[PDB]
Structure 1
Amino acid sequence: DYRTFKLSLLTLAPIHIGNGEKYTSREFIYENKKFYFPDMGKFYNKMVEKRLAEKFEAFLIQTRPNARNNRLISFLNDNRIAERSFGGYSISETGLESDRNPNSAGAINEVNKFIRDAFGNPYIPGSSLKGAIRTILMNTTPKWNNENAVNDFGRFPKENKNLIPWGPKKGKEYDDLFNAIRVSDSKPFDNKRLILVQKWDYSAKTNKAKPLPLYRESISPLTKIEFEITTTTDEAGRLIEELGKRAQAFYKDYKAFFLSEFPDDKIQANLQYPIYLGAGSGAWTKTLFKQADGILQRRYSRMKTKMVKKGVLKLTKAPLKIVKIPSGNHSLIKNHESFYEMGKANFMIKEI
């Protein structure tokens, strides 16, 4: 009575899923064309055997570094440390990680961490992919993407969480649809698939991309990640077997709604069924944009960073990659300024 599907995810762009934590510049070393993230405990243990525990503690305690005492490489240089075996991991320098020089200005002060397990290995949680799938399914079902999805009985509008029934009811048959759809997480991938992209915003009014101080740990483009999706009812089986051709319908609506207002070279092409995963893909990829139009922008009308019209396009920077497919040679992006549509990925779902 259970159906099992295999969802293969191929990232077409950097994908970041955070845990709320951030590396500070006193925690990583930019050298030898790489970002080295040591283990703080191992670093401190090696620094108590060199009689520099008090110096390192004064370095970390200092709440107001001026411009250069905020970097760990300054501590490693002043105090004459040559050892680099502190555990941790490394990220290969891309070049398009900061619009300025990472070793000259303030530059990368904070890095948003990717989600990891207790062993320090990155992975994609099943809750994240389930949320993306739920957005795709809710946007392409006319009985959920209607005006009844907005709870207007309040100070400001919000979502009608009771539109898709969930939970037990007194004396009624159990009617939770999304309990039947069970998305598992991934087996952890390696830190060799991680890059240090930066947030760029492309405005349809300014007609240019503006960089922002928001650096993330992201999966590199062309990464293969496998998920298992289990279905326990029949309706959810139809929904999941229709995950493609619903992702295509959602992307068609999204392109006709938002992506059509931007230059074609800034918009990526799809090899498989499209999806948007993780942080940075935008507000319209995470909402019912047909019903959230108007409400979402007025939520930010009284902030300094005002949402104007339908917002800006999120375009990170990451190295250009060609792929070999049956059609020949395919460029992941159509522009020469190395602009990936942040959060974009493709998938194929089979019926294992």
Structure 2
Amino acid sequence: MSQYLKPFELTLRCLGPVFIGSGEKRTPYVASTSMVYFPDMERLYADVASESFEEFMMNTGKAQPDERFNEWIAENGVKVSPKNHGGYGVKIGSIVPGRAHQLNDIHSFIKDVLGNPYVPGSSVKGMLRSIYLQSLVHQPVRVPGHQTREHRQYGERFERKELRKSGRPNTRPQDAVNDLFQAIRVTDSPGLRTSDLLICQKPGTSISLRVVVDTSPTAERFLEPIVYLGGGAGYRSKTFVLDAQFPKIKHVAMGQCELSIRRAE
């Protein structure tokens, strides 16, 4: 290796499910009792030599989702099944449901090119962005302000105070160049099998990752824990010490992971 730089690793085992949004949505899928059939859309236009329901794919109106999109098409001469049409599926757990406030359209995790998912490297770099500034403030600084412009702003003006100390004689500290948090180098996780994410209304998967600590731009203690990030993670897991900004009355009175130091190589 080099003298300013060593490799490092870390544990990442999730216990609750992991959902990172990516601006992608699934829409009428089969919402039935035992099968959620996610098929290949490329194969439904191979009997043209067709037009059973692929004219009604456009056609929707003032109707409720998951009414008739799956109880009509298989009763024709279509011969739809797994291993004969193809595709994949993540299946339902316990509830059907029948709650009041059925199962609506479902969000999307990030996948690589084939539906094979991964935890993002940017989030697991942003996970530790919620750690090293966040931990050792223990007076402990607050988030003082009445309006939404000055509720959360102390995550900004404190992030450039004791975190940008590379200290070149010709650049300011409080910008993109003089950071010391650019020491370790996160590598994004590889692609896994299909059924790892499960349907949630808001599980023991092994993920490893390479991080490479560096002491090049600095002119060893950086490396030195059951925090929850990767999905629905709450209101106090993003920064240090989110109800007052939205109008909610009670301000006046599922992603479990694990991290521990591991110096393997």
**Shorter-chain-normalised TM-score: which range?**
0.7 to 0.9
3-state SS of 1:6 partner: strand
The 5 A counterparts of 1:91-240 are 91-96=90-95, 98-100=96-98, 107-142=102-137, 146-147=141-142, 155-159=149-153, 160-165=155-160, 171-172=170-171, 174-199=177-202, 221-233=203-215, 237-240=220-223
The answer to whether the 8 Å contact 1:138/1:144 transfers is no
Is the 1:152–1:158 Cα contact (8 Å) retained in structure 2? no
Q: Distance in 2 between matches of 1:168 and 1:57?
A: 64
Seq. identity, %:
28
Kept in 1: contact 2:115–2:194 (CA 8 A) = no
Q: Match of 1:111, SS?
A: coil
**1:61 to 1:114, Cα distance in 2 relative to 1, 3 A:** same
Retained in 1: the 8 A contact 2:39–2:88? yes
Displacement after TM superposition at 1:133 (Å): 1.4
Q: 55, 58, 83: which is aligned to 1:57?
A: 55
CA distance, structure 1, for counterparts of residue 214 and residue 222 of structure 2: 12
Compared with structure 1, are the counterparts of its residues 68 and 229 closer, same or farther at alpha carbon in structure 2 (3 Å cutoff)? closer
Determine the C-alpha separation between the residues in 1 that align with 2:91 and 2:120: 24
1:297 to 233, 243, 252: 243
Q: Aligned pair count?
A: 247
Deviation for aligned residue 1:99: 3.0
Tell me, yes or no, if the aligned pair for 1:59 and 1:69 is still in contact at 8 Å. Answer: no
Given that 1:135 and 1:287 are in contact with CA atoms closer than 8 Å, whether structure 2 keeps it comes out as yes
TM value normalised by structure 2:
0.77
Label 1:15 to 1:52 Cα distance change in 2 as closer, same or farther (>3 A): same
Structure 1 unaligned runs (5+)?
200-220, 248-273, 291-295, 311-341
* RMSD (CA atoms): 3.5
Correspondence for 1:83: 80
Matched AA of 1:123: Y
Asked if 1:347 corresponds to 2:259, the answer is: yes
Which structure has greater strand proportion?
A: 1
Return the letter of the residue paired with 2:245: R
Q: Give the TM-score of the pair, scaled to structure 1.
A: 0.60
Whichever residue aligns with residue 124 of structure 1, its letter is: V
In structure 2, relative to structure 1, the CA distance for the partners of 1:59 and 1:228 (3 Å cut) is same
1:308 Cα deviation (Å)? 3.1
Larger radius of gyration: 2
Alpha-carbon separation, structure 1, partners of 2:139 and 2:120: 25
Secondary structure in 2 aligned to 1:9? strand
Please give the alpha-carbon distance, in whole angstroms, between the structure 2 residues aligned to 1:154 and 1:193: 38
Structure 1 pair 192/154, CA: closer, same or farther in 2 (3 Å)?
closer
With over 3 angstroms needed to count, the CA separation of the structure-2 counterparts of 1:11 and 1:192, relative to structure 1, is same
- Gaps in structure 2 of 5+ consecutive residues: none
- 2:250 aligned partner: 308
Q: Distance in 2 between matches of 1:81 and 1:176?
A: 60
The amino acid that maps onto 2:197 is L
Which whole-Å CA distance do the structure 1 matches of 2:139 and 2:103 have between them?
42
Cα distance in 1 for partners of 2:78, 2:139 equals 60
Please tell me whether the aligned partners of residues 147 and 245 of structure 2 are also in contact (alpha carbons under 8 angstroms): no
State the partner residue of 2:45: 45
Q: How far off is 1:348 after superposition?
A: 3.6
